[PDB]
């Protein structure tokens, strides 16, 4: 495993990873339609925020125009991490991906995604209610945010070494029933601020919830 190290992170990256995955409020809503905007690669959600002292609108970055054309004006579900710092170059928050078409994507009963954990090779039981979804087709972002929230609350994943954070290297694996893999290095952080750290979700990678499990490999070395 050629996993990136916790020590290799930039000055404020660790604290900002801690904010995104454990503290920061998430953009979680159903049945939303993007407004008229001439901007390429982005969806504008006017009046998304109700009673927020900083934001009114939500700006969603999808990367390409082909991804934007698929979701522009369409009925959509939102689940992702939003940020205000370095967003739109006012009263607007930004997000990378976390977009799924609303219609016919809901389940009758919420799918609890099983988590298989390994701390330096040792297997450890994870409560089943940690990672859960109500969607048939789910974004990787929706699952990763829930998985990294449990990791920080339990192990102090994004806490400093002096603050009890023992994990130095980590790997999150989203294993699909067909034998497909989506894997993110827990410490391969791009930059130090959410505008660059959350850029991994821009591709808007969506996977099937039916018979899907999560594989986690944590190392204190």
């Amino acid at each position, epitope marked *: 495993k050629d996993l990136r190290k916790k020590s290799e992170l930039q000055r404020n990256a660790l604290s900002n990873l801690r904010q995104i995955y454990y503290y920061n*409020e998430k953009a979680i809503t159903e049945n939303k339609e993007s407004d008229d905007q001439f901007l390429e690669n982005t969806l504008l959600f006017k009046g998304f925020f109700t009673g927020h002292p900083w934001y009114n609108d939500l700006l969603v970055d999808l990367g390409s125009k082909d991804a934007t054309n698929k979701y522009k004006g369409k009925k959509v579900d939102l689940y992702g991490a939003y940020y205000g*710092y370095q967003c739109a170059g006012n009263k607007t928050a930004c997000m990378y991906g976390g977009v799924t078409l609303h219609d016919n994507n809901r389940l009758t009963e919420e799918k609890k995604v099983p988590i298989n954990l390994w701390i330096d090779g040792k297997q450890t039981t994870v409560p089943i209610d940690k990672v859960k979804t109500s969607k048939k087709e789910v974004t990787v972002q929706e699952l990763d945010l829930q998985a990294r929230h449990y990791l920080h609350g339990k192990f102090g994943l994004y806490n*400093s070494d002096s603050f009890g954070g023992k994990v130095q290297r980590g790997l999150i694996v989203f294993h699909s029933s067909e034998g497909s893999t989506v894997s993110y290095d827990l410490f391969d952080a791009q930059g130090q601020y959410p505008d660059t750290l959350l850029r991994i979700y821009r591709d808007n990678k969506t996977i099937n919830s039916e018979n899907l499990h999560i594989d986690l490999y944590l190392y204190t070395t």
Partner: T-cell receptor
Amino acid sequence: GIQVEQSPPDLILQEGANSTLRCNFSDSVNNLQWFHQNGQLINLFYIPSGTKQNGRLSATTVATERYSLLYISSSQTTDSGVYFCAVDSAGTYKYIFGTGTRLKVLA
Amino acid sequence: TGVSQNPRHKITKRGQNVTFRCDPISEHNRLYWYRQTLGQGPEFLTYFQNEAQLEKSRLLSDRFSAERPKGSFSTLEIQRTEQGDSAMYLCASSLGGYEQYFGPGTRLTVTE
């Protein structure tokens, strides 16, 4: 890095007299503020450039010459305490406060 | 000013962990943390802009952790307090690079 120098460090004023407090800084500024401390920092002026007035108090900052002046007209015993100058400086952010001007107004 | 801080005063035995809270002016996106020792001016510890920590001073002990837990408010944790930690911990808020509004401060006394 960014350096702030306030003069005089200590000032003795007779009741009713006027005085000019100086703040010198090393680099170009985006934010310059003058404060008065009693342990609550009282905001006197936000002045990165130009001239402003606030009653018996007045301030002026020459951004190019890298200095800021604070004028106290008709000094009162309540004007006693520490006056602070603080800058942000337009690499790595740090908001730097000066050592301050401790003012003692003689009744 | 509109910036709140709790507790206003705090006594801790040396070696104990202490946590302070700052509630900024709602509209302000920027939040600052300062330390002020007797006779000296306020010293920059760290600052936030929205949900992100922008900078922490190079000379700031690994015993310090500043977070924005649930929106606007911020917490400052000092673990294993020592006599040298006895200071006035000041919090400030602003709309970007504009005027900073200070809180009443937290008087911390670290006793033996």
